[PDB]
Structures are given as structure tokens and as C-alpha cells.
Amino acid sequence: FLSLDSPTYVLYRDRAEWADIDPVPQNDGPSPVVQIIYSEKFRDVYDYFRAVLQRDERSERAFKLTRDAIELNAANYTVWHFRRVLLRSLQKDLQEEMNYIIAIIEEQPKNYQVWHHRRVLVEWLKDPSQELEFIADILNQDAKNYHAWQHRQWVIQEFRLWDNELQYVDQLLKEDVRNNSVWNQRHFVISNTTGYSDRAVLEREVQYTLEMIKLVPHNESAWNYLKGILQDRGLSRYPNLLNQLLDLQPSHSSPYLIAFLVDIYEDMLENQCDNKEDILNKALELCEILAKEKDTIRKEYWRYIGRSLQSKHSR
Amino acid sequence: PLYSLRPEHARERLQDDSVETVTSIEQAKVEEKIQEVFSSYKFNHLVPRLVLQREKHFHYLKRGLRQLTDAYECLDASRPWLCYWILHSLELLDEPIPQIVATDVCQFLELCQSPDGGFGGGPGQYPHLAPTYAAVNALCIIGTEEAYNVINREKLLQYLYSLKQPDGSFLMHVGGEVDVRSAYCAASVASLTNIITPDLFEGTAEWIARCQNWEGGIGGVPGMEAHGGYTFCGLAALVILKKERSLNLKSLLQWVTSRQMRFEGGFQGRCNKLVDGCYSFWQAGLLPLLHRALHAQGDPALSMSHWMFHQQALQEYILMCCQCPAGGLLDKPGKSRDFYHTCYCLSGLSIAQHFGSGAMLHDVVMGVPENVLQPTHPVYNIGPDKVIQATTHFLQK
Numbered sequence: 001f002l003s004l005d006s007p008t009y010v011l012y013r014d015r016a017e018w019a020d021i022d023p024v025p026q027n028d029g030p031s032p033v034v035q036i037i038y039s040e041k042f043r044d045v046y047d048y049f050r051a052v053l054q055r056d057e058r059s060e061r062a063f064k065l066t067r068d069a070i071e072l073n074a075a076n077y078t079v080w081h082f083r084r085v086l087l088r089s090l091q092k093d094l095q096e097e098m099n100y101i102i103a104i105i106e107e108q109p110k111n112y113q114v115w116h117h118r119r120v121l122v123e124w125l126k127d128p129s130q131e132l133e134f135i136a137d138i139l140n141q142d143a144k145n146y147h148a149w150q151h152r153q154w155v156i157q158e159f160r161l162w163d164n165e166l167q168y169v170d171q172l173l174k175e176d177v178r179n180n181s182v183w184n185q186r187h188f189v190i191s192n193t194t195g196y197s198d199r200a201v202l203e204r205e206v207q208y209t210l211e212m213i214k215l216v217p218h219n220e221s222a223w224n225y226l227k228g229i230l231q232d233r234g235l236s237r238y239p240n241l242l243n244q245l246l247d248l249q250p251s252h253s254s255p256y257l258i259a260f261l262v263d264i265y266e267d268m269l270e271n272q273c274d275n276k277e278d279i280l281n282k283a284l285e286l287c288e289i290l291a292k293e294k295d296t297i298r299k300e301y302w303r304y305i306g307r308s309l310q311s312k313h314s315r
Numbered sequence: 316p317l318y319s320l321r322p323e324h325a326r327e328r329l330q331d332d333s334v335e336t337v338t339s340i341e342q343a344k345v346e347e348k349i350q351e352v353f354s355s356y357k358f359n360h361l362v363p364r365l366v367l368q369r370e371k372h373f374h375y376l377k378r379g380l381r382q383l384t385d386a387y388e389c390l391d392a393s394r395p396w397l398c399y400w401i402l403h404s405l406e407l408l409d410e411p412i413p414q415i416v417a418t419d420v421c422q423f424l425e426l427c428q429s430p431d432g433g434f435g436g437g438p439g440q441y442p443h444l445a446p447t448y449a450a451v452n453a454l455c456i457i458g459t460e461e462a463y464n465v466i467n468r469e470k471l472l473q474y475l476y477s478l479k480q481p482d483g484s485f486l487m488h489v490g491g492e493v494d495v496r497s498a499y500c501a502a503s504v505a506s507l508t509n510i511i512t513p514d515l516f517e518g519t520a521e522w523i524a525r526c527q528n529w530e531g532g533i534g535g536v537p538g539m540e541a542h543g544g545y546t547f548c549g550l551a552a553l554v555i556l557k558k559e560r561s562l563n564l565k566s567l568l569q570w571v572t573s574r575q576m577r578f579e580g581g582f583q584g585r586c587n588k589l590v591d592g593c594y595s596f597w598q599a600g601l602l603p604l605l606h607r608a609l610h611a612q613g614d615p616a617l618s619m620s621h622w623m624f625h626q627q628a629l630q631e632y633i634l635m636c637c638q639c640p641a642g643g644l645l646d647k648p649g650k651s652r653d654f655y656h657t658c659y660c661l662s663g664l665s666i667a668q669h670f671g672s673g674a675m676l677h678d679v680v681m682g683v684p685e686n687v688l689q690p691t692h693p694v695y696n697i698g699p700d701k702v703i704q705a706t707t708h709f710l711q712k
């Protein structure tokens with residue numbers, strides 16, 4: 001039970017425990033392509049893994065061999081497979097194996113294969129008692145870690161552990177209101193716990209989202225959120241919005257406000273409103289301030305909007 | 316002169332509203348660095364100065380295709396990609412593949428191919444759909460009947476069926492999990508080979524659409540933040556399945572387009588996150604798709620001369636901030652060369668220089684006219700010619 005990294009490490013070739021088994025080299029063929037010049041430590045391990053694998057040796061010695069193969073290339077799904085195999089036949093204590101996996105994730109928070117394993121374990125034992133603390137620790141190093149969030153929504157849905165999630169959400173939103181992943185996690189906890197159809201909740205969110213805009217006006221998160229939970233029933237269906245935004249207009253402007261208003265006008269026209277032509281201009285006017293000045297990088301797009309509107313609300 | 320260098324562009328830097336957060340601090344470091352970049356090319360500019368290093372990028376590819384250092388050892392179980400990225404990057408850059416190299420390559424993928432369908436990360440590894448989309452893609456790049464016959468279409472189709480789920484989603488691999496990408500893989504693969512039974516993708520058009528959220532984009536699995544790698548896979552997968560409309564295509568376009576960075580010029584992968592090397596294909600690479608759809612529906616307001624993203628600015632990025640002198644292309648300045656971005660920056664550039672919808676065909680080539688890259692199909696990201704050769708071939712079985 002050594003370690004791939006101990007200064008006292010020894011190849012499997014120069015080992016006694018592994019004397020009885022012939023390693024199996026790779027087969028890149030007679031004339032190899034995109035072939036890797038594996039080191040000698042790396043190559044060793046796998047020649048001895050293929051071996052175990054090739055003979056389907058469900059042995060307690062190989063079980064640990066897989067731990068070194070994993071560490072040398074944790075993106076190797078085949079080895080990860082052969083480990084779950086050994087875990088179940090060898091019948092290894094899966095909680096000791098949870099401590100293992102907690103460790104690799106802390107070491108490579110960005111592997112897609114190292115989280116699936118932890119998903120396998122957790123459902124193998126029906127125990128989410130940890131997880132959330134874990135997931136919080138990982139996201140405490142990188143709060144926009146895709147896999148963590150994914151594995152966290154899983155643990156929450158699968159074990160109905162909502163409760164304190166919108167709570168965690170609010171926390172992270174303070175730590176960095178620009179964390180676009182937390183504005184997602186937030187919509188995840190809400191649309192599945194109380195939905196937004198509820199007039200009070202949709203109202204609670206919009207005020208927060210609004211008082212959050214006013215705080216950091218150029219944060220594009222608090223905007224996509226106030227634009228996506230409302231564009232549901234129809235951005236046009238909420239009058240009072242189109243004004244207030246025109247109020248924040250001076251000391252809170254940004255093409256994120258000017259863009260928003262365009263979005264509003266577009267839907268209004270879509271729900272056959274009044275001052276038709278008048279609005280149809282309040283839009284094409286804003287399409288230009290943007291396409292030509294406040295948001296040039298997106299010019300080719302703010303022109304499509306312009307032409308799209310004219311071709312469909314003026315004739 | 317150049318968009319990225321016009322004086323007014325200094326007006327496109329981040330405004331943290333005097334409220335510093337981690338995201339703000341991190342995006343600040345990036346804009347500032349990318350500023351020096353645009354700024355060094357502000358002490359000179361004598362003859363055509365934005366050049367794509369064809370040759371430097373060529374040794375890089377040319378060599379890695381035959382042998383890689385001990386560095387790319389973690390790609391140990393993902394070699395088919397190494398075959399794809401390189402053959403597609405050589406393709407774009409316009410370098411023929413020695414008819415010898417091809418057979419050698421056809422021989423490799425051959426060894427990965429599972430006796431039950433699909434391809435593994437390398438010789439003697441279980442079948443998975445990532446390397447399978449790579450193999451088939453790499454073999455279709457080669458387009459010789461030698462390449463085409465490598466694929467065991469029957470076992471390919473049985474395998475795909477073994478990953479199928481009741482809700483119309485595909486497992487990434489046997490025992491593995493499912494994200495949008497796995498769908499784009501099964502379709503892209505089952506498409507070119509012409510092995511689509513009538514019930515193979517049932518419910519997938521549906522499951523894919525279920526991944527589009529409040530941002531307008533698409534995430535890996537329902538409820539995930541919007542992401543460009545996946546957003547591409549979602550649409551392109553649907554475009555193949557002919558269901559682009561199954562999506563709220565408008566909130567999508569609005570999401571993609573907003574992802575391009577007003578200062579940097581390139582695309583970011585998620586709202587409020589750093590600009591990045593690829594995403595010049597995973598993101599910008601979407602506009603070609605949305606066009607076909609928006610136009611397939613009629614919509615008369617689609618430009619006839621340009622994609623709906625700033626092409627000038629994207630090219631000005633890839634060419635001025637992602638090329639390593641040594642060769643290959645980068646994430647963002649000072650992030651290390653790798654065959655992955657080396658491919659998706661050349662694919663995105665190509666996408667940013669090539670426009671066409673119907674009879675119209677208008678190209679924009681920032682830099683020197685020698686930077687004109689080879690066209691690339693927006694769905695399979697392989698030469699639009701090779702796509703034809705592939706199907707036209709397999710559509711006879």
C-alpha cells in the first residue's frame with residue numbers, strides 16, 4: 001500500500017509482489033501515430049495494468065494498482081471502470097473509498113471522470129450526509145466549477161435536500177455578486193421549490209435582482225436573471241418595469257439597461273400595444289445607440305434586431 | 316486601422332462600478348494584459364502586420380501527428396482526438412496528408428475500435444463516444460475508402476443503442492453519465508455513416524431542448540449554467556436531428572452574441588467568466604447554425620454578407636493574442652500551446668473569415684490575405700467537402 005509519489009517508490013517491474021505476472025506492452029502498431037513517449041514510471045504501471053485487466057484479475061493487489069493508473073491519468077475511463085469492478089468483487093469498504101475520492105477531487109477539481117465515481121459511490125450507499133459540505137469546500141476554491149455544481153444539483157434533486165440551498169445561494173452571491181453560476185443555482189432552487197408563478201416570490205426576486213442591479217450596474221448577471229424569469233410570461237406583461245428602468249437610466253445606465261428596454265419594446269409591439277409606431281421608434285432609436293456606440297462589438301446583431309423589428313411592426 | 320486598436324476601444328474596458336469582487340479582479344487582469352498586446356503593435360505597423368504563422372503552426376502539427384513528448388501523457392486515454400485535432404488543423408491550414416500517413420492513421424483508429432462498436436481512447440480501451448466522434452471525424456477528414464471502411468457501421472449502431480436511455484439521452488460511455496455532448500456525439504457519428512434507424516434518436520430532440528435555461532443558452536444536463544461547449548453540441552445535434560426550432564432560438568442567439576467580449580474580441584464560455592482560446596468555434600461557431608435555422612423559417616432580416624458576431628474583432632483576437640511563436644494556438648496570452656486550442660482557434664478563425672448562406676459567399680480576411688483559412692462545416696467541424704464525400708459514400712449501404 002505505497003504511493004505513486006513517495007521518494008521510496010519502486011516500479012512494478014522491480015517488484016516482488018508482481019513477479020508472477022508478465023506485463024503487457026501497448027500495441028501502437030508497426031508504424032505509430034500521435035504516439036506518446038510515456039515516461040518510464042508511467043509506462044511501467046500501465047503495462048502491468050493491461051496485464052491485470054487483460055486477464056480480468058479481480059485481485060486485492062491490482063485494486064491498488066488501479067489507484068496508481070488513475071493518478072497517472074485520471075481521465076482514463078477504462079481504468080476507472082476496472083476499479084469499480086474491483087470495488088464490488090473485492091467488496092472494498094466504500095466509505096474508505098469515499099475518503100479516497102474526496103482526496104483526488106481536491107487535487108484535480110476539474111476532472112469529469114473523478115466526480116462520476118463519487119456519484120457512483122454516493123448512490124451505491126444511499127448517503128448524501130456529506131457531499132454538500134464537500135461540494136462547498138471545492139466551490140470555495142473555484143466557485144464556478146462546473147462539475148461541482150452539477151454534482152451538487154444531483155445530490156440536491158436526488159435526495160430532496162433543498163432546504164438550505166437558496167440560503168447557501170445568497171451567501172455566495174455576497175462573496176461575489178458577479179458569480180453567474182450562483183444566479184443559476186438560485187433559479188435551480190427556486191423553480192423547483194416554489195416556482196416563480198407565485199406572485200410573491202417572483203416579486204421578491206425582482207426587487208432583489210433590481211436592488212442588486214442598482215448596486216453593481218455593469219454586472220451582467222443580475223440582468224440576464226431579471227430578463228429571464230420575467231421573459232417567461234412575457235416581458236410585455238409587466239408595465240411598471242419599462243418605466244423604472246428608464247428611471248435608473250442616468251446614474252445606472254449601461255447597454256444592459258438600454259438593451260433591456262429594447263427587449264421590452266419588442267415584446268410590447270408583440271402584444272399589440274398603443275403608440276405602436278411611437279414605440280417602434282423608441283426601439284430602432286435604441287438599436288442604433290447600441291449598434292453604433294454603446295455596444296459596437298454586437299453591431300451585426302443589433303442591426304438584425306433593427307431590421308427584424310421594422311420588417312415585422314411597420315408597413 | 317484595427318477595431319481592437321481604435322482609440323474609442325479604450326472605452327470598452329471593464330467597469331467594476333467601484334465594487335470589487337473576484338470575477339471583477341480576474342477580468343481586470345485579462346483586459347489589462349490583452350491591452351499590452353494590442354499596444355505593442357502601437358510602436359510600429361509597417362507592412363501587413365497580422366500574420367498567421369502557417370509554417371510555425373505546421374511543424375507543430377506535422378510532428379505531434381507522429382509522436383508526442385511525455386507531456387501529452389494525460390491525453391493517454393484520448394488519442395483519437397489527437398488524431399482529429401491535428402488532421403483538422405492541417406486541413407484548415409491547408410497541408411496535404413501524405414497518403415502514407417493516412418494509412419498509418421487508418422491503421423491506428425483500427426486498433427482502438429471496439430469489437431462491439433465505437434472507439435476507445437487508444438488501442439485496447441473500452442469504447443466511449445468522445446473518441447468515437449473523433450475517430451469518425453478524423454477518418455472522414457482522410458476521406459479515402461481506406462479510411463471509410465475502417466468504421467464497422469453495424470457494431471457502431473449496436474453500441475450507440477447500448478447507450479440509449481428511455482428519456483432520449485445517450486450515456487457518454489457504458490456505465491458513464493449523460494450530458495448534451497453525448498447526444499451530439501451519437502448523432503454526428505450515426506449521421507455521416509448513415510446508420511440512423513427510425514427510433515434511434517427518439518426523445519433526444521426533446522431531451523436536448525430540455526437543457527436550455529433562463530440565459531437562453533444550453534447547459535450539460537437540465538438545470539446547469541449555460542455553457543458554450545454544450546450550447547454548440549445542443550444546437551448542432553438538433554440541426555442534424557432537424558429540430559433547431561425545438562429551441563427558443565431567440566433567447567439563444569441573444570445569449571451567444573452577448574458572450575463575445577467587447578474589449579477582448581473573442582468569446583467567453585459563460586456569462587461573467589474569462590475570454591478563451593476556443594469558443595471561437597464553440598460560440599461563434601453557433602451563429603452559422605442559428606442562421607440556417609432563422610433562414611430555414613423564412614425570417615427576411617438575416618444579413619446576406621455577415622454572420623451575426625463581430626468577425627473583424629474575433630480574427631483580430633485569434634491572430635493577435637493566441638498564436639505562440641513556437642507554433643500552435645493558445646487559450647489567452649501566456650497559457651501554453653496545446654493541440655486542442657491549436658484546432659479550435661483555427662476552426663473559429665475559419666468561421667470568422669467565411670460567410671455564405673445560399674448563393675451569397677462573402678469572406679472577410681483580417682491580417683494578410685495569406686491568413687485565408689480553409690472553410691469548415693459548422694456542424695461536424697471538418698472540411699465541408701469531406702462531409703459530402705463521407706455521406707455520399709455511406710449513403711449507399
Ligand SMILES: Cn1cncc1[C@@](N)(c1ccc(Cl)cc1)c1ccc2c(c1)c(-c1cccc(Cl)c1)cc(=O)n2C
Nearest residue numbers: 110112387390393396445544584591593652653654655
Ligand atoms: C473546460 N475547458 C475550457 N477550455 C479548456 C477546457 C478543458 N478543461 C476541457 C475539459 C473537459 C472537456 Cl470535455 C473539454 C475541455 C481542457 C483544458 C486543457 C486541455 C484540454 C481540455 C484537453 C482536452 C482533452 C480531451 C478532450 C478535449 Cl475537448 C480537450 C487537452 C489538452 O491538451 N489541454 C491542455
Ligand SMILES: [Zn+2]
Nearest residue numbers: 591592593646
Ligand atoms: Zn480553451
